[PDB]
Design a binder for this molecule. Structure first.
Ligand code: CA
Ligand code: CA
Ligand code: FE
Ligand code: FE
Lengths: 168, 510, 388, 72, 388
């Protein structure tokens, strides 16, 4: 049974998340799920057409379990893993402001999202890091944006050029 | 005891002092610039005066629509081709209006000076009015027009086709995702100032020529609000002009914004004007040159020169790829007609003469192709022919730019024909120009949008359509059609029988 | 010329004839109802829903989205245009919300426009009728110019508190309401200034400058905890739902209501001031309008979500508890204002009654919805401790 | 209790008939051969405010059509 | 049929082609200003003037008339449709009058319509906010229900006083203004009942029936002389200008202003009543709007007539004297209501000062305009005698 909004691979993951009954297992499965299927650095592109929807159905389970487990002060200040939100936040920003180049800066930001995107980290700290990390990322990238010729830029990105065609 | 009152200006007089200082009083959005907290706004408005001036325009507009226009059966006496064209124009513009709401919300958060926040705020509410106005046009044509399908459900049926993806780039995501200032440039500095402002008025012209008095009534009302938004864009640059970061990033965020916007409108707007109408107003090549080169590129950008703003470096490159852009696109649009939510028509004899006269060489390429498809029966549901088959037969793959989502066929194009294909961490990427390629190479995580071939790979056409509800009331006849006549409409079965199955064109390089 | 050069297809004989000849025999589909696929909240689909629901291009990975796939362009770093990651709240469908007043742009500006013109007329009548002659000078020159004026910053702050939500709201019906909740707040702020500007016109040595009321807000003692709480709800909160919920279902429902309805709307009359109450009537009307929407979203939709009821309720009780303290604090500082009123204006017995009014209505209108078992007595007593 | 409530035209009009009262000179100032019944009733239960609103709604459509679409 | 059966000349190809064929090349006259021959009151002719002045087909034998000859059909006996004989006042031109607010029908119902809907929102906000909780019971059940209620009959009576003028006014501009002055009076009377109707819905036991207010008006003492004055102005005056002038520049300027503004607007607030002042705000706005029109007609146009100035002032001074006594009697009886108030509500000095405020405004806005030698202390002295 194929489909855009309803398909076998999605029904597969719903029964899989339904088996989760521990913020520990749930949180971990979301963390790993993001490592394997999101961002241009994903471990594979096999779930490309459903990962977005599945991730959310996974965030829900984690969020609920996190509410039934954490207390008021924790749900507001600690990650689903136990980490202290502000700690992580302040540490990541330090690494970012220390980043020597855009290549280093981009890895810090992307990795931050795959690891702490809610319901892992509290939204307030998460979006707070989003404004700081993103600011540092753009500042490094947009500096002399066009200096590097495409030929060299492709080598920097490390892309595998499969075909080039240009009449002009 | 003389009668006394207080006007908007008298209150706005003290609006700037409304904001106060405190540690965490700063934007919540990532940005490379620093908006000066003493920036002022042009129009001295307060919530109540704003509501009044807009309520007055609403009155005329709806009064015309509900009374005189309805009495004249204005919703019907419109050329079939234009009734269809407005399904796309109004609904697509509606999303631009809708995302502009969030964009100006982000900009209002970005501004530190109370007056600048107020200026952005007026636009927030304006973009809301415009969202509902565009919605009303479709709502009106649905209620009183010659063909409600599409008008009545574009919000969900637009998801079937490829043209919608690129619209979301310049009208949705480009408006709200990125540095607040980058978004401001896409929306106001370029989008509104260079395209939408002249466009909205232009649309009312083509509508009038094709019997449509509904659109002019609404779009002309929308137009009266655009000056406040022009100012907002202009004021955005004035606000950051003094921050040294500006001299380091403004001209790049802008050039990227220029390319982003023109990349979609250059072919799409020209296509809708010339191919979605019967009676013409002016050749798009002439229009484009004036809008982008004369008015915007010259006059407009020129005034921001004292602010360190320069003409987009990709400008001359935009003009080169432009000439045949819209003609190339309609070939793909028509070949893929079953994925839309509107009915398309092939050029008639008078029209082909118009194209050839304004575009020497048109007939030998596009003209002969259209007559071939028609003689082969592309308009007749019993022919078993859909133009997409012609592209396959003649080995003319159709790609989707990973960045702009704009469809392109370098093998057939009369315009740009460059093609760059790369592979990164197990994924293939197709690019149609040097500017977009750079954007992805530099910011690969900003551009992961899946194209229709990737999503629909392995699926049979009639199934994608049925699942995404591309059917009319009878649950059998397609919303989309290869002609605009009342008889011989294609059904889901006429499509199913073709056994057309989607394939990802990039895989041929494996 | 008299006829003009532009030929119109609806009126031009030649062009109209061509159009008429192309027209189908009858409409190509009998379904002339735009938005026909939207689930009606009421017996029949209203214009409000047709024109609003699904305007937001969300894909299915955002609860309720009808589109598919990722966004075309995202933030440097990968942050999505709109995403589940911007709010702790979860739901089966972000498009469930429905403004009970069904306000889309047209009706909204129509009502506010009427109010603007109604206001202008009232001011011309008030000034011509010389009603200013019966107003107590101390109340005018001190409690209106300084304390009422200062409150304009409070409202202004709650206004800006909506800025992020205008960008992050996950649906059209929620974004429209949010936008209107904030716009009405800035309006209130501009009305407080308008009154001070009106008074400056009809009262010789009255200064409309915000200098005085501002310093009171920024440095005074009465609104100190008020400002600190506002600066917080606005700039320390990054969750758009927490921001809206905490502003309308916590802070402004308790502090805002007491200041407006229980202090100025109750004492102004006693000083020959029917001017301030004219403007407070709007603010109160607005408050009640907004509340019906605040209630439908967080209670009817989220708090009672067929799937995340318990969850969302746990999140809101957490927010309630989180902001209830800075609110009660804001109230305490405010209590120090009574000791500045002329002797015999009011007594501890009355204020105690007004406090229970605000608290009880709150428990009745918000707290009891998410089951935030609150204690009226403890709250009131905690507030009264601010009295002279 | 404390439910948003208001009052409409019909509700007030129900008491309009009682607005008039008796007094020696309460009589028409114009010559007439007839005597209009003292308790005659009217078909539409209107009051100034409602009459104004229903007519303003018509004016909106009328003048909007005239000044906008018809002029264009 | 999608197109319909009826063919329209504006859009039907064949018909429009015939119409366009017969059209001239340009307008047959370049004077495209309707009413160009009307003498503009202000810099440029207004829409108000164009659409109004000279609508009344008066012949030249009625000052200002542009037509000629007798009427086509007159009353049995010979009385003209409209004639000089219906009023004592004389003028050079009955069309000189201008409503300073330039109100023709559309602007008039637009504003009243805004007020209607604004009122509806206020009551919904007031009721939902539970503001009734702080209203003094005695004030509500006795003074609003009985005494404010009784006042509706005063306004109703003043409304009816305009019936003859609607029929006899000697010009369009005057008739429209008079019609509007009368329509606002009935509106105010209905807003008083509306308030009583509202209170009956939010206050259990409150009776909206007019029985009590009506018995107070017809048989009570507080309003005895007011009613006697109203019955007179309404049914004993056969001159449309005497009625309009005496009602607006005498009785309502003194008695009306005292009751509405100095009594209810002034005291309602002291009993936690923000409801009544809401409706009095509308009455006062209407009063001030009418004043501008009344002053223009009687002072600017007639009292200052280049040919009949002295004559007209003599007549108006006569009317002022004729009706000042019955108005003083009305105020005098009204003084009896102060005894009904709870001890400590107000005192003789406050009452006296408010009386002087109304008398001083009247002398300023009216009496002095026609050289009527009013003795403010003698007038106040006469009224105070009514204080028990
Ligand atoms: Ca005293
Ligand atoms: Ca004297
Ligand atoms: Fe817009
Ligand atoms: Fe705009």
């Amino acid at each position: 049974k194929l489909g855009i909004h309803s398909n076998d691979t999605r029904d597969a993951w719903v029964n899989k998340i339904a088996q989760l009954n521990t913020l520990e297992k749930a949180a971990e499965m979301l963390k790993q799920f993001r490592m394997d299927h999101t961002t241009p650095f994903r471990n594979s592109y096999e779930l490309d057409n459903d990962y977005l929807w599945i991730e959310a159905k996974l965030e829900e389970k984690v969020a609920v379990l996190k509410a039934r487990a954490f207390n008021e002060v924790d749900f507001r200040h600690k990650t689903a893993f136990g980490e202290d939100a502000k700690s992580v936040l302040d540490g990541t920003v330090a690494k970012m402001n220390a980043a020597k180049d855009k290549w280093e800066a981009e890895k810090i930001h992307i990795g931050f999202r795959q690891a702490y995107k809610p319901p892992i980290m509290p939204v307030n700290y998460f979006l707070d890091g989003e404004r700081q990390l993103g600011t540092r990322l753009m500042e490094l990238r947009n500096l002399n944006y066009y200096d590097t010729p495409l030929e060299e830029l492709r080598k920097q990105r490390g892309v595998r050029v499969v075909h080039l065609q240009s009449p002009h | 005891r003389a009668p006394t009152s207080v006007n908007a200006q008298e209150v706005h007089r003290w609006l700037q002092s409304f904001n106060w200082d405190f540690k965490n009083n700063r934007t919540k959005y990532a940005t490379k610039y620093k908006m000066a907290n003493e920036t002022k706004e042009q129009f001295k408005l307060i919530a109540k005066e704003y509501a009044r001036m807009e309520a007055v325009k609403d009155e005329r507009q709806f009064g015309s629509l509900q009374d005189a226009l309805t009495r004249l059966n204005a919703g019907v006496r419109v050329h079939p081709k234009w009734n269809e064209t407005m399904k796309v124009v109004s609904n697509f513009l509606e999303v631009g209006e809708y995302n502009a709401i969030a964009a100006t919300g982000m900009l209002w958060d970005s501004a530190q000076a109370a007056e600048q926040k107020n200026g952005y705020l007026a636009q927030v509410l304006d973009e809301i009015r415009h969202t509902h106005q565009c919605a009303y046009v479709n709502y009106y044509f649905a209620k009183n027009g010659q063909d409600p399908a599409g008008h009545n459900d574009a919000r969900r049926t637009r998801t079937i086709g490829p043209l919608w993806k690129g619209m979301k780039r310049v009208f949705s995501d480009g408006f709200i995702s990125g540095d607040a200032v980058e978004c401001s440039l896409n929306l106001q500095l370029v989008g509104e100032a260079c395209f939408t402002n002249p466009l909205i008025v232009a649309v009312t012209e083509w509508a009038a020529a094709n019997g449509d008095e509904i659109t002019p009534t609404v779009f002309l009302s929308i137009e009266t609000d655009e000056l406040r938004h022009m100012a907002n864009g202009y004021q955005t640059v004035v606000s950051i002009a003094n921050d040294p970061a500006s001299a380091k990033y403004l001209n790049t965020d802008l050039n990227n914004a220029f390319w982003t916007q023109q990349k979609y409108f250059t072919p799409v707007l020209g296509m809708l004007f010339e191919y979605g109408s019967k009676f013409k107003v002016e050749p798009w090549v002439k229009t484009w040159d004036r809008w982008v080169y004369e008015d915007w590129g010259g006059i407009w950008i020129g005034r921001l020169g004292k602010y360190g703003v320069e003409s987009p470096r990709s400008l001359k490159d935009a003009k080169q790829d432009a000439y045949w852009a819209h003609h190339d696109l309609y070939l793909l649009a028509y070949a893929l007609w079953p994925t839309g939510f509107f009915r398309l028509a092939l050029p008639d004899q008078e029209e082909m003469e118009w194209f050839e006269a304004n575009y020497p060489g048109w007939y030998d390429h596009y003209g002969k192709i259209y007559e071939e498809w028609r003689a082969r029966g592309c308009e007749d549901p019993s022919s078993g022919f859909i133009p997409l088959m012609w592209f396959i037969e003649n080995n003319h793959p159709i790609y989707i730019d990973r960045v702009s989502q704009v469809p392109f066929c370098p093998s057939l194009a009369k315009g740009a024909s460059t093609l760059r294909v790369h592979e990164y961490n197990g994924e293939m990427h197709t690019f149609s120009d040097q500017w977009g390629e750079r954007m992805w190479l530099a910011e690969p995580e900003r551009y992961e949008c899946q194209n229709i071939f990737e999503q629909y790979e392995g699926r049979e056409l009639s199934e994608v359509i049925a699942e995404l509800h591309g059917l009319r009331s009878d649950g059998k006849t397609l919303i989309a059609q290869p002609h605009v006549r009342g008889d011989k409409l294609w059904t889901l079965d006429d499509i199913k029988r073709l056994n057309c199955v989607f394939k990802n064109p990039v895989k041929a390089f494996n | 010329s008299m006829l003009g050069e532009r030929r119109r297809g609806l009126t031009d004989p030649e062009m109209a004839a061509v159009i008429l000849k192309a027209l189908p025999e009858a409409p190509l589909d009998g379904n002339n109802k735009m938005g026909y696929f939207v689930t009606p909240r009421w017996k029949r689909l209203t214009e409000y829903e047709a024109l609003t629901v699904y305007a937001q291009p969300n894909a299915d990975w955002i609860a309720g989205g009808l589109d598919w796939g990722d966004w075309t362009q995202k933030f440097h770093g990968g942050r999505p245009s709109w995403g589940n990651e911007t709010t702790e709240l979860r739901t089966v469908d972000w498009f469930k919300h429905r403004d009970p007043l069904r306000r889309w742009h047209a009706p909204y500006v129509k009502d506010k426009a009427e109010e603007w013109r109604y206001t202008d007329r009232f001011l011309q009548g008030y000034s011509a009728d010389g009603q200013i002659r019966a107003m107590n000078p101390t109340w005018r020159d001190e409690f209106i110019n300084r304390y009422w004026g200062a409150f304009l910053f409070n409202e202004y702050g709650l206004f800006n508190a909506h800025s992020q939500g205008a960008r992050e709201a996950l649906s059209d019906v929620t974004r429209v309401s949010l936008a209107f909740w904030g716009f009405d707040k800035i309006d209130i702020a501009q009305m407080i200034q308008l009154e001070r500007g009106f008074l400056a016109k009809i009262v010789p040595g009255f200064d409309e400058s915000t200098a005085v009321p501002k310093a009171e807000w920024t440095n005074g003692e009465v609104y100190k905890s008020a400002r600190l709480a506002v600066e917080g709800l606005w700039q320390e909160v990054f969750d758009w739902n927490e921001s809206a919920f905490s502003v309308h279902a916590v802070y402004d429902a308790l502090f805002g209501q007491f200041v407006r309805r229980e202090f100025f709307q109750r004492l102004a009359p006693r000083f020959g001031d029917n001017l301030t109450p004219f403007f407070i009537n709007q603010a109160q009307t607005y408050f009640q309008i907004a509340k019906q929407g605040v209630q439908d979203l967080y209670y009817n939709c989220l708090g009672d979500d067929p799937e995340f009821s318990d969850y969302n309720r746990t999140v809101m009780r957490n927010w309630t508890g989180k902001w209830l303290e800075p609110t009660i604090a804001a109230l305490r500082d405010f209590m120090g204002l009574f000791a500045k009123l002329p002797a015999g204006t009011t007594d501890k017995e009355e204020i105690t009654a007004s406090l229970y009014r605000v608290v009880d209505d709150w428990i009745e209108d918000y707290a009891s919805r998410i089951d935030f078992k609150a204690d009226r007595d403890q709250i009131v007593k905690a507030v009264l401790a601010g009295l002279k | 209790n404390r439910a948003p409530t208001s009052v409409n035209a019909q509700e007030v009009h129900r008491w309009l008939q009682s607005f008039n009262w008796d007094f020696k000179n309460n009589r028409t100032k114009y010559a007439t051969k007839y005597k209009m019944a003292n308790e005659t009733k009217e078909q539409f239960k209107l009051i100034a405010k409602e009459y104004a609103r229903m007519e303003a709604v018509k004016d909106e459509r009328q003048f909007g059509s005239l000044q906008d679409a018809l002029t264009r």
